[PDB]
């Protein structure tokens, strides 16, 4: 495992496992694409509301 | 409700018996005072 | 108003030189209130032709209305040790500077 600091040295898609927060270790990876909660989430929800 | 007129108040009945005796820690008025004009080391026994 | 519409470079006011013996924040807020009042005139219909500013603590303090000493008869303030003849001595001599020559 790494520390939340060492995660600074990763590529745009490299996977590393870090000690997140107070305790548990979770495998982590940098994100591709913005991946926000903008209209895209609304479309899946409002389309069904027809 | 009973009225409270100027004739209503009654003097408090203070108790009866032997006269009361003082109980303070130190004498209040009947206290002599041996004085000194020390301008003293800040010590109790020195000045005493 | 037709003149202040000619400038589009208004920024957030910042104090670059304080008065150093006065009331800086209420000088800043008087400007930030002048801008607001001029905005209100624009939103209203027709020019009032005279804009009386809202009497607020900022204007009162900037104008000095809240600093002026209160008049008191001599009988009351006899004991106050700070009484002294007005302008007792303040001919502070200040030397010549070039800014007047440039002016």
């Amino acid at each position: 495992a790494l520390s939340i600091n060492e995660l600074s040295n990763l590529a745009k898609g490299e996977k590393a496992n870090v000690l997140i927060g107070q305790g548990d270790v979770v495998l982590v990876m940098k994100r591709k694409r913005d991946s926000s909660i903008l209209t895209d989430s609304q479309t899946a929800t409002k389309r069904i509301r027809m | 409700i009973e009225p409270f007129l100027k004739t209503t108040p009654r003097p408090l009945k203070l108790p009866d018996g032997p006269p009361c005796s003082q109980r303070s820690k130190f004498l209040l008025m009947d206290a002599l005072k041996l004085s000194i004009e020390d301008p003293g080391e800040g010590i109790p026994l020195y000045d005493a | 108003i037709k003149c202040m519409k000619t400038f589009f470079g208004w920024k957030e006011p910042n104090i670059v030189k304080p008065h150093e013996k006065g009331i800086n924040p209420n000088y800043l807020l008087t400007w930030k209130q002048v801008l607001a009042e001029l905005q209100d005139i624009e939103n209203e219909e027709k020019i009032p032709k005279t804009k009386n500013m809202k009497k607020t603590s900022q204007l009162r303090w900037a104008l000095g209305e809240n600093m002026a000493p209160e008049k008191v008869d001599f009988e009351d303030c006899k004991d106050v040790s700070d009484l002294k003849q007005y302008d007792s001595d303040e001919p502070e001599s200040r030397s010549l500077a070039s800014w007047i020559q440039s002016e």
Binding site: - | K25, L27, D30 | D76, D79
Partner: protein, 51 residues
């Protein structure tokens, strides 16, 4: 005048606050002065303590 008394810590700290007693006296006097000053719209400290 010789007597055999007795004391405890609570009584000791209680006796170490007669300056708080001073505070209470000043509080009452200042309350009266402030009331009269408000009524007459000026400071009556000098009038109270010198007249």
């Amino acid at each position: 005048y010789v007597r055999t008394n007795g004391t405890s810590k609570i009584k000791m700290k209680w006796g170490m606050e007669m300056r708080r007693c001073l505070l209470q006296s000043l509080q009452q006097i200042e309350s009266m002065i402030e009331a009269e000053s408000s009524v007459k719209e000026k400071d009556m400290t000098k009038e109270f303590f010198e007249n």
